[PDB]
Design a protein around this nucleic acid. Sequence first.
DNA 1: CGGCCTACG
DNA 2: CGTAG
DNA 3: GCCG
Length: 327
Amino acid sequence: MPAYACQRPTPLTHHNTGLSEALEILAEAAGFEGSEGRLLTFCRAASVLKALPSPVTTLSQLQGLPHFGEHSSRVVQELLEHGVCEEVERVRRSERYQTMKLFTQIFGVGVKTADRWYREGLRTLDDLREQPQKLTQQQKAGLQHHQDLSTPVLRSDVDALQQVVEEAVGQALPGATVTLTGGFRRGKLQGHDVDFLITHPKEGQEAGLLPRVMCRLQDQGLILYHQHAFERSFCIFRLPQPGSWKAVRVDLVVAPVSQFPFALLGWTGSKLFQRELRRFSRKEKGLWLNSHGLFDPEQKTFFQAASEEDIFRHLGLEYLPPEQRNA
DNA sequence: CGGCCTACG
DNA sequence: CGTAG
DNA sequence: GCCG
Ligand SMILES: [Mg+2]
Ligand SMILES: [Mg+2]
Ligand code: NA
């Protein structure tokens, strides 16, 4: 078992679902308390279990696995012995965890805002609605649409959304392309948001594209909310349903074709996979990775990539297709 | 012990 | 501060 | 919380 998630395939479904989930509760809880280090360790330990070829049945099978120390091993031990881990259940039950989870789910509310509200005594969505002067316009939209946004989107819905985006993009810039990214590109059959990456084969033609796309989608009556030069747009779209519609979170991202492989890689995730990949790049290879490029700080040069395959090769990693990036 | 991804709106 | 993966 |  290699130490970094980007060094091993991680499929979407696996053989340690219950164990990985429990560890992820503790990771999430650590994030709500601002302990990013503990969040990372619990996420990494959970991800290691996702990468295993069969179920963990005995505590000895954790020996030599990276990211399993005293704490994570105890959680697994308790689950193997009793079917439940008391620490995990205490977190699940807790008013702090439940409220921080509820508040951070809201589009426009992060951990810092949620925590402040929690400290002020606020506990429910209706608590927030009663004091609307305290809310940003983004948070107001997040709160209005919370119920719809809490329901996952199906792949058939995504395909319908992609067609409407493609029509707008085609008018905004003929020849521009739209690529589905995020969890759906990793093979997810449903998910809580839809991500699209837009480019054009002629370098430079994409400049100024996103406002033109947004204006056109707005004119079509499809945009329930958006933030407004820019290159990422975090939207709430109107998605058709039988006899009605629902609100769906859609992200639109533009990249020049020279950067497309990097943007595709970054936006395809998973979140942990990409953090791990960037950590690997810098710490093991001395190269700096982001969604625009890969920089050698010694030679002061950027690696030209024509594909995700190029990027894995330049980092000395075996290629993983998107459906094995579910770290 | 230091480090934990790296951006844009 | 929020957002993204 | 764990790695190196
Ligand atoms: Mg997504
Ligand atoms: Mg998204
Ligand atoms: Na949020």
